Write a protein that binds this ligand. Structure first.
Ligand code: ZN
Ligand code: ZN
Ligand code: ZN
Ligand code: ZN
Ligand code: ZN
Ligand code: ZN
Ligand code: ZN
Ligand code: ZN
Ligand code: ZN
Ligand code: ZN
Ligand code: ZN
Ligand code: ZN
Ligand code: ZN
Ligand code: ZN
Ligand code: ZN
Ligand code: ZN
Ligand code: ZN
Ligand code: ZN
Lengths: 170, 170, 170, 170, 170, 170, 170, 170, 170, 170, 170
């Protein structure tokens, strides 16, 4: 069904153009668009619409102000998870993006956000769900600390310790 | 199988005669007929049926009232794409022809139709699908703008801007 | 595989002989047999079985009493569609044959049947599926008006109006 | 792949030899074997396994005692349906063979079995599924009438009437 | 190898004698036999096979009742096409002979058959395939018109109009 | 390469000697051997292989008990068809030989076999495939009728009627 | 994709070598290996993995001590069913192998196991599922009788009567 | 769809490079990469993603410190089960890897881990789920004994007896 | 291209020398070498590689211990089948050689191997594939009977009866 | 079919003229045109359309501003891969051209683009897909680093290190 | 077409010059170049491109450090297999080359590599795929044994035993 392939390609291109209008970085969009058109040529519906979900999540994150390194790691992990047709891991990634957007809007320092976001996106890309959930809890704790008035240095230190604990396996 | 070659040649000739009875311009039919007979000589079925599809799309476009320049560019691109046995590119071309036919029937100015149709047909001929899809979105936008009551000058200006945006690469 | 080509040729010949025993007109069978033997020479299976399906549908239509003009147009269209290996268009044509057979058995006037059947078969030959579907709706409506007791003159008038609307593009 | 063709040929030959050991008449087996070897030469798997299914159904029918006329008609229809790779029609044919075998075992008179079986096999050969299903219902009714104690003359009359009704189209 | 030349000569002579027994006119067979023996002296296998095909087609045409003027023109065109080893044009010629035989058996008036047959044979002789295919379509239309009950005079007039259209180039 | 010519000649001579040891009549083998050596002198591989296939089919037919007149007609037709390198017509002839061998083994009367076989072989020699396929169906029907217990006189009458229908063109 | 074919071939060869190390008879593995390599040459995944399933089942049966006659019949039936891509019939065969292995380990007499296993494997080869299921119930019943202390002679007699009942059709 | 094949190949290569960065032994990665590229050439999505799952599980096991012998056996079993597209067996394999990783991190002696892991991976490779589940229970029992303070010698002995019981079939 | 002829000649000579080093009898190699060089002179690729396949199969058979008489018959049949470029019959012959090698290695008596092998090679030589496949089944049955412990006299008797049945045509 | 050869030649010439109008360097077009005409002479469709794809990719790359050395290496590799009829390798090459075009548009230093592009094109020419995919990942990483604000010297150093690792084999 | 012959000759020469620059020994390149030019004279595309694949595999093996004796045997076998146009056997040979390259890079002793590689290449030359696949399993086992720390003497002994088993046929 080539008409369905054309419909999926048009969906991907329209989502990419809307995201570009919203202010999403163009390199991430180029990666997602290449993967999406490749998947639309073979009529893979679920993967293409998971990519569209990732694009909308990136729109949210880019509006919030999430740093670019975390966005690059998240985009790569999301492309691989959309290739999986893994809806659960994709939902976990979208929840991570939402938490990082809240953290960035709340004024959490950029270094802590980059640390925890990169670690959690890598853990999600490696199909390691419990550790990713622990890092999600760490992000929520950081947001609450920022709202409580804890200084930035202590927040960065706490993020570093919790991330190194997640990496070490303790 | 020379009988199969004769069958394909008769299919091409019947399609061209029907298109002539419908009012399709004769030079485009001459191009398609020469290419189709050459392909039928070697028993190339898929290319021949792609050419028959292009003939039927030309019937639709000529009935609508699409300008001749766009039809010439479309015919050349369609012959080249039927040579490649490119079903997806041919389907995109047929979708473009349908959109241009709707735009012509709706009263969109001839200058805008020529601009967007020629640009999109050239992009499809160069195997550039994302930019062609963006131009298809431009055609849809022109049709809706005409239905909304936007004056012809603004429609021409918008078509020129978007077409130059796609051509330049922005 | 010449044995497979012989098998397909025998399938075509058996179908044609059974159709002749059933009362299908011989000229339509001659066209189908020539096309089918040409396609069997090159071992084109799908096209040959599509032609066999057309033969069986013609058996049904001839038993019902569908007029010869519509049958000729349908046979030519079906041969051309079997050449394309277009299963969807062939199925739409067979559904059209069935609706025309029901209309003939129900006593719908011959003029209305010829008008709508010729128009729909031509549209199916030209790859115009939405308009063909609208004309199929017209056939069903005519059958219902005949069952309701509407006089023949009104049925002919309604068929003429709807067919002219389909041709004109309204 | 000539090894696959050899495997398919061996499957057909083994099935034919087993059916011959079971008591299936040899002319039907010769027809099926010729068709099967022709299809195995071109590596047509699905058709070959449909022919093997038909051979097993003929084993069942020959063990039950189905008359030879219905078996000849069924074998020809089944070969042609296996050529189409029509799994639905082949399943309807096998279901018909099963009903005829049950009718023969139940003592339904030979004339009724021949009448209904020949009519239903011809209808299945012509891709007329609803009428074939009505005739299958007729076979079931005949079996129940035989089990109820209705004399053979009334069973024959009922079978003749229902078969004439199906053929006439009423 | 002169043994192969003798084999080819015996093939030609056997075909000519069989055609004589079937009722093919003797002057046409004289032309074909002279051409065939000349081509057999130099061991031209393909040309001699094409000539034997032409002889068999003449058997069919003379059995049907095709007029003699068309037969003379067809024979000359067939000899000159066999000289070229033109399998496609020879196949087109044989298809024309078959269509004219169907027309002659169907009762189409002799004048229409002569007009269209002479025109199509001359066009095939001049290597004009598209116009010859248009004239083949005209022959098919004549046969269907005769089957529909159209009077002889109208058939003659329509054949004249279509043939003059083809000759004039319209 | 005359070494290849010697190889082909030795192939022909070995096939002829094996067929002679199998009981094939000698005049047919003389005809085939002369044609085969003439074709091997000029290094015609495909024609020689077709002749070897004809020899092997004659082995089968002579073992079954096919009458001699049919064998003579079949041998002449096969030599002429092998000269044309006609794989499809040669395959049809081998299928006819197989069906006649089955009929002869099944006890079909000699007159019926001679009638249908001579007619079908002549039709295959004249490149008339549809009527030849109809006569193959007739042979199959004769075998089934003999298996069903139909008397010899009725079988002869039916074969006469169907063959005269084939000759007459009905 | 010849790399996939090499992967499938290596899968078959590895399974065969493992089974040989486990003590499966070598002739059965020879049949399975020939079939598997033939199917891997054409990249038939499902058939190859069904053959691997059969190999593992044979490993289980050989470890249990199932007699060789039943194993040969089962291997031939399984090769033919893996050719079918018949997952349901293969599952029934594997469950039969499991029941026969349990019966062999439980001390059921060899004669009864051979009788019921050969009968059920033949019924599964003939695509007769209800009778095969009845024989599977017979195997389970025999295992329970052996565990209950019934003497071997009574077990053999009961198996003989139940198998004869299944074969006869009662 | 060669773009999808390129996407799958890039996914496999990215997973292999990440695993190499994590410390997985290179020979196992070479095996998995070769199999994955072979399966991506034919566009087998599910198998490729099962291989990626195996790679991530190997990352976990290598980080924990599972001995190399069990890892080699597990890699071979995982490649073969991914060729199966057997999601359930792959899930059982991954659960086995997780249990062995926990055992290694808990200080269970290397010999016991090697014994039970090799046995369970072989049983999974032979599609024997219940025995593999029993061996999984054995691994959990060993972890609990190590946490309870049982010395190494009795842990090794218990693993040996339980594995011997699983292999023997008791 | 005589360089290609030289390449083919060197391929034949290398294969023959390797076969001589493996222990294949020299006279069979002389026949194959003469045929191969003659076919290489005329640049016949497919026939030469078919002969190389035959040489390798002879290596396998001579290693196993197949009797010499069957080897002579097989070599002559293979040369004449390679002349025909018959890949299916050559594959059947190679499958027969493999089965005979298995029978010879398993200890099947020499008389049985000679009887069945000579009969099947002669049947393959005469283009009789169904009977050859039945004889292949006979060879497999002999191997299984030898593995089951049946005495040599019974194996010889069974082979004699089945081969006599194959010759007689039953 | 010389008409098909002319059609392919006109396709190549039209593509080359369009590429000149777009600004592609003339020497690369001269190489591609010579290769394409040589392939069109022998009627090699797939190779010619692969060359047309390479021309279009060159249009994209030349518009972006890709350095000429990488373009020369890519053109030579693409010509040899179109000779291969290797759709997968050609698609990998086109993906590499797209990534290099994105890198050139993003401002990545010319030295890094030349280094990585030349290495990856050479690896693709030598049929080393995994290392080419690693280098594609390197190109993506360079683009992201340029978008992040990393200085040009660091980008050049990183590209040199990664390319040296790929070439060395680490 | 001699232009295509020139294109193929240039492809062979370019591949040989690149391989020479990579460090492949010159005598193997001389053999491949002579064979490739001879095949290019006759326009044999598939064989020439199989030879180019063999050259690239030789590049990989020579870079790894595979001994020269194995390389000579592999080159001769590959030239012969490319003459056959045997894509499956060529792919098995290339995968063997890759496994030997991995073994050489991993430090496996030269004696083991030479033994197993020469045996497997000879088996692939003789079209013995199952035994070649067994030896490929042996190569993988050697690589894993080297990675596990087994001393060189035991690796050599195990390789010798497995190769002797394969040669003997056990
Ligand atoms: Zn938006
Ligand atoms: Zn029209
Ligand atoms: Zn819209
Ligand atoms: Zn009918
Ligand atoms: Zn309705
Ligand atoms: Zn049975
Ligand atoms: Zn005649
Ligand atoms: Zn007509
Ligand atoms: Zn013989
Ligand atoms: Zn029959
Ligand atoms: Zn095992
Ligand atoms: Zn990782
Ligand atoms: Zn050897
Ligand atoms: Zn067996
Ligand atoms: Zn352009
Ligand atoms: Zn990226
Ligand atoms: Zn290189
Ligand atoms: Zn391994």
């Amino acid at each position: 069904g080539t008409a369905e392939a054309l419909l999926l390609a048009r969906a991907i291109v329209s989502a990419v153009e809307d995201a570009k209008k919203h202010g999403v970085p163009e390199d991430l969009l180029a990666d997602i668009e290449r993967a999406g058109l490749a998947l639309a040529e073979v009529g893979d519906r679920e993967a293409v619409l998971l990519l569209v979900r990732l694009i909308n999540a990136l729109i949210v994150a880019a509006e919030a102000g999430v740093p670019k390194e975390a966005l690059v790691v998240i985009t790569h992990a999301g492309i691989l998870l959309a290739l999986d047709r893994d809806e659960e891991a994709v939902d976990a990634l979208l929840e991570l993006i939402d938490r990082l957007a809240r953290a960035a809007k709340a004024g959490v320092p950029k270094e802590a956000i980059v640390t925890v976001g990169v670690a959690a996106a890598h853990l999600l890309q490696d199909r390691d769900l419990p550790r990713a959930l622990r890092l999600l809890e760490v992000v929520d704790k950081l947001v609450h600390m920022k709202a409580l008035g804890v200084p930035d240095e202590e927040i960065i230190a706490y993020a570093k310790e919790e991330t190194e604990r997640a990496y070490k396996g303790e």
